[model samples]
Target: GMQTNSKIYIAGHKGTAGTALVENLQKRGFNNLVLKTRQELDLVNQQAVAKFFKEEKPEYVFLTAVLPCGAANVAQRADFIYENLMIQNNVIHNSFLNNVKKLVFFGSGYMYPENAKNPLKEEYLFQGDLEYGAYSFGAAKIAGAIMCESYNIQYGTNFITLVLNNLYGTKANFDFGKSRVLPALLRKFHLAKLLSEGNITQILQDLKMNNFEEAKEYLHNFGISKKSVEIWGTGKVRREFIHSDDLADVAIYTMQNIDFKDLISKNTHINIGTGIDYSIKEVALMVKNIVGFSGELVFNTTMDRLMDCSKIHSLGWKHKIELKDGIKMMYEWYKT
Candidate 1:
């Protein structure tokens, strides 16, 4: 492992994964970290990334910045793909140019095909078509992996891609328009409770309800006894999730224990998850219970998928947080 004082840069440190990385690293006493907000350094700009690298000269880099729930955001699909591609391209290319010692690129489980076998394996990628609306984002991730592989082969760079499943924890996005299943469900339930129970805080009241149709409708018909949670998709889609803290734990584990030379030789990309699965309906029920939403649950039969995690487990790493505990953990945080 690199020295504690080594300059480590976490691109997209403001994002959920990036935040977990920073917290874990700092907690473990890795102090010499380099971070930047989007306002401070626009990663989409090639020249800005190059200049930052030239100045900071960070020895380690984690590329965790990407558009969240790109698949679900149909309105801006092209923007999602374009921005993610640009960010990955600029960061990976610059990392190579600056000769960083090792870089970890974050990939998504959404890269797998919708109909792929349960418990997705690393080898299953590109075997079939990706899920609807996820193609562009998945393609970008695939491209990022290929780029890292090519760089490793030609320049002997140490770039490893850690493919992740659905993630939720503190600092997660709760906006209905962009958040993933966990955050979206949590937000809706909390708001429903606040609106129905009558102890609504000013902060909660100030939250925008434009994107959340059900919430707005409930508010419109307040005290008329309409109570329910509306969900998109069939609620039958199976999924695997890793708490952000667990993701951070395994990410650091992979970086510290796995040798870069060995990674290149063995193909440097792998999946990281809890090796467990849950259906959307099951997840929603759990969230409803956690938030005390005694209302009805409705499904929209929209979209769903699952991910596998044998590869990472084979490497002697396992997730500590169970899904139930994780949901409660996030709910408590959201409540506060």
Candidate 2:
């Protein structure tokens, strides 16, 4: 067994996923975990990260910090480019400097080629056009992945990347504008329910099929007016979602079991998500039904992304949470 007294450093420990990781570790009896709030340690500062790494000399590291959650907020492309580059560069370099035993870097599903085939395989990373426009955040992720592999190959650092699908669960950021699709929707409907306000802010247009239906029904059943319903996208794009806890589970497994020798030679990285994806319409309709909304649904049709994920499943590791089940859980979480 590894040393029980071994230290573990997790960047962005207070983040939704990061907090889940720490809680899971504690449940597993890991008491020597170390972490930093953004205020405590600015992850963008290389010297500061290096100093912390050199001083603490943690044996295990989780590079679980990155930017740009979804397309709605892709305007922060500059921040994504900078922060992602800084974290990946600093983590790999500092881990090597401190002789860390393991590192697991988590990243976005958008990093997969925008037009890449479904069930994305680890090998499909850079095979085609990288879709730099819609997903500017992905460019930096590509760089981070390259760095993770390069460090493992050249310096023999034990490192792995878990390219994750859309994630949602307890502790998720509930802010509509800043959170991912599912969380944003959950908050919207939950808040709508509490206010008894018939207004449904059209966050992302026609992407949600069920929500469109819900709006219609809200009008029919609840007499809610269509005037207050707003939508963002055209309801055509498809996407996949995996529970954050599930992502955390695989990440921990990768950290504990990934073989560096085979990993480096294989250029291995695993995709984390359900194999299949559906139209934004499908998701929206389901959200509407889940939230008991009924009104005329509008479609904006101008949204940014309808990401792909088939290749990830082809390489293996399918998402276990069905969309309905995930929605049910999220709805219950919001209800409570």
Candidate 3:
């Protein structure tokens, strides 16, 4: 169990998952926390991470500092793999070297085989090839999970790899170029609503633009209209999602309840998810309704939708947030 005074380090303390973890930890009264932004600590730098660990000597570690798997694309695949590997290597190695009491490494659900069955079971990891775009980031996460298991095997370290599903909630990236489908759709539909209402001025102000021309250009950039919204893939692939807060809830719960002995005994990491699945079309329509997008939905039929969450359920941990409610909550948060 985490003591109120334990020196806990949340590595990616600024990203969506990290922010949720921070809030959850504080709400639970775990206050002796250590946090650093990328400016303060470059996690990819081995020497820097080593020095930080040597100085901070945090008792508990949450290694959430990696490029979100979805952020990786063909254009920057090598960078994605290299950066994730470096960050994972540096932090996990230093945690072991520095004698950290317990460590939780965050892994991605996208690491599973693309062809794997829905409600994915943990054993399906590495059973088949990963989804095409996901290869680099998925490989890195798998490596991290294995590294944690290896550390436990060789050094008797207390580490747990929590494989989380597609996450959405507050602080998520919502830009068209970078965000995943959920946030991207929210922005698209919201902006479309503003554009439809002839509220171009308000839209311009919201975008911090001072002129009508810039607003028009901005709308052009977003591909805004009420005609049709383009989706990346066929919109038929099924996936599971967990709210960031619920993920944080499970993280803390696992830390308190699951032990290294249990982890090493299983010889595999636990999958964290809601156990339910949804097609991309279903979720997109849900987001559209919530955002009030009065347009047709079109598909490119070329993206990956991915997950399984049974292991975490077997551990008696189930997610409390439902999809519709979670989407509404996220849209509200995004508006603010």
Candidate 4:
């Protein structure tokens, strides 16, 4: 367990999960945090990571430094394949070498079998092929989780691996580009609502783009219009959404109480989520209701993802926020 003054370094503190964890620690009176922005220290820069860990030597770490699914996929994939792998390799390796009291690495929940069964288990990660886009990127994430286990087994390190479901937070943004799916849809609907009212001026400023000609081209790509917002395929895919605050709560719970030994027999990792699942339209309706988008929910397509959250619950941590409440919170973030 980390002491009150133990130096806690949350890598990537600017990110949603990282920021949530940092605030959670502060609310709990853990003051000795060592925070660094990308300008100060870039994790992918192996030498700097080595230097920072060696000199500052924080007692605990939460490695949230990652490149989420986005442009990396469009730029042909090798960038993240190398970068995500490199970031984790440097951070995890340095933590092990420095003998940090304990460390927690957040693994991507997307790293699971595409055709796997519902209530996905920890062991399902290696059972079959990965989804089309995740192969290279997920390979990096898989190696990260396995790397922690490998260190724990070989060097007696206490590093723990945490896999999480789709994460959103009150502080999270619904930026049209770069956000995850939930935020993407949420942002799109709001834009559609604006367009539905023919509020192009607000749309231009909200989009922060100049000229109607440019905005017109971009809005069409997003399928936003006065009629409705169209998504690809039928929206029947089921998934489990977990709030960032919920994960932050459980993250501390796991850190202070759980250990690699406790989870080693099952797997050197645990899944964190509110086991309850909802379909794509069910979630869209929730967001639609919260965002107050009056137009019909037109849909084209979707995904089904759920985790068997029994392991973490068995360890005695339950998720506090439900999906509807999370979406409601998200609206509050956007409204102001």
Candidate 5:
């Protein structure tokens, strides 16, 4: 129902990526908006979510509500697993039970098996070993697809699980403690450029705002200092990044056209990404070039963590924004 107005509920509207999706929707002229703060409803509580769904009866549901901790945290924490699993379980099942017209569940490409083919495809799931570092978090997202599949099979509901690649864009936090690499590099270069431009005000703003502590800290943290920007994994590992807006587009596209029958038979799974990839060295150099940063690059022999990207691309959806241009857009978005 890509009409002028449709009842839409963005579950995690407060999140970085979810906020981008909401903005995209508003800009597209969908006025019948519905939202909820965590204070208003605890999505993890099955009964509370069910009651709200039945009361609101919103036609569309965006299941972006889940704990998104990174690799290290997933490795170290047990609580992340339980919390994410609980939220997915309650919201997805409840959505079906309440007869939600369309439901979209957000997921990550990292859910693909480790030894699966490069450029992981949606079908590559369960083909190999799960990377244990992000296993707990990844497994939950993997389960979300199944939940949607099960509901589709049993209840004849329309549910889609979109497994997106490393997504980053404007509105993404620059917090090194929580933000992903793309955002972290973006803020790093932006602040560095601010200081380079003698924009003492912006520099102080970033410093006071804690965007990034040291210019080299961004480099050193990744071991990419003045020695040619230290690369990860010999710069051979390849991965992809998709902007949040593009993902929002695909998320809506799939839901509008894909029926419960289509998804259940096909596992109710899709991958949203550029289907293009670059080595970490290429990415690092591109970031450095974009910011005009003259830093030495070094490759850490031991550091290598790259997600499979080709599998998603092979689905006939190619990411339009090239890496160089995409990073520029991202930087400009952050500049304001």
Candidate 6:
């Protein structure tokens, strides 16, 4: 789908997925990438995206970019990935129009139900209701995948979408309310350790807080403290995580080796995951130990989010990093 010096345009090149793709592609000696910021291109705008696609005519496209629109309320805005609905239509349609060689998009496991079975398969999508809390986002992703399928059937486009497991790695969003459980755990335990050992300077620098009172007060809303840290949900749930680096590898691999026909010949997105899951309690303890936080972990839990990677595994790609080393590396990144 791409070659050395190919015109590869990564829409979200600065994001977790985007950064990993850029780094890995460059490592493989593929230069000539087009990276436009949210300021440079408003992906949700139909005319803007079409104009950019026609002018640049990039051979390959990656639609992992996100937007921060102002339609939703203030509270709902932050957790929103900005990859909402409009961005999908505008970018995906423009890729089709440009006749790009291949376009790749990332969907989430959230597209499946919270109560879905332990190991979700690609076929499991749309069989049950999605988690309401994440329904809007998941629906957009699901729609994006189907939109790819539709374009493939109607226009013979070679766009592919893969369902991502819980992704965590370097450059992950560690914001209190804007990130997943893993990054939040890292920051929570690290900060809790800071508060416990009186590392006020680090805390102030990290949070930009006015004082220790502000830290304590703001943290309380999320149930963080010097004594113990609470997961916003119950610790009973189990989750699977794929490092962004591994995801990047598989994304590029599939784009080069596979096609739309191979991915969803029967109308389903391929699942890219490790097919390994551990309890939230188990993962939290690992983080607590890695961050050297001796504080007690509070249980709160569901969304037993895990995915079956039989498809990607059969394609001969496996995840490189394990949870233990991944968390440790993430903590190191956070510290810096």
Q: How do all models score by TM-score?
A: 0.84, 0.79, 0.87, 0.88, 0.83, 0.85
lDDT of 1 at 148: 85
Candidate 3 error regions (>4 Å): 69-73, 195-200, 207-223, 263-267, 293-295, 299-306
Q: Give the TM-score of candidate 1.
A: 0.84
Better of 2 and 3 by lDDT: 3
Clashing pairs in 3: 119-308, 120-308, 233-301, 233-302, 234-301
Local accuracy of candidate 6 as per-residue lDDT tens digits, 1-336: 678989999987878788898899999999899999889998777888889999999999888885432223435643454547778888888888788889888888888876778788887877888776666677777788889888898888988888876777776788765777788788888888888899888888889876878777887877778899987566776878889888888899888898877654555578888878998889989988998887898876456878788887877788888889888888888777
Task: Report clash pairs, candidate 6.
Answer: 67-82, 233-301, 234-300, 234-301
> How far does residue 265 in candidate 6 sit from its true spot (Å)?
3.5
Looking at model 4, the pairs that clash are 231-300, 232-300, 232-301, 233-300, 233-301, 234-300
Give residue 246's error in model 2 in angstroms: 0.4
Report the error of model 3 at residue 129, Å. Answer: 2.2
- Candidate 2 is scored at a TM of 0.79
Lowest summed lDDT over 10 consecutive residues: which window, candidate 6? 66-75
Which candidate number maximizes TM-score? 4
Tell me the number of clashing residue pairs for each predicted model: 4, 43, 5, 6, 17, 4
* Candidate 1 backbone collisions, by pair: 120-308, 233-301, 233-302, 234-301
lDDT of model number 3: 0.81
lDDT of 2 by residue, 180-296 (tens): 677666555544443354434542232243464665654334222333234466777667777767777767766665556644355366666665677777776777778776544
What is model 2's C-alpha RMSD? 6.6
lDDT of 6 at 133: 61
Candidate 1: regions farther than 4 A off:
69-72, 173-179, 190-228, 263-267, 293-296, 299-304
lDDT of candidates 1 onward, in order? 0.78, 0.67, 0.81, 0.83, 0.70, 0.81
Give lDDT tens digits, candidate 5, residues 220-254.
Answer: 56443333444445777667777777777777776
Instruction: Give the per-residue lDDT digits (tens) of candidate 4, residues 1-336.
Output: 988999999999999899899998999899899999999998889999999999998889999988876543656578768889889999889988888989888987668877888788998878888877767877888888888888888888888888876788876656666577777778888888888788889998888997988997898888877667787667787878888888789888888999887875436688888999988777777877777788877766433778888888889899889888887777777767
**Lowest summed-lDDT stretch of 10 residues in model 3?**
301-310
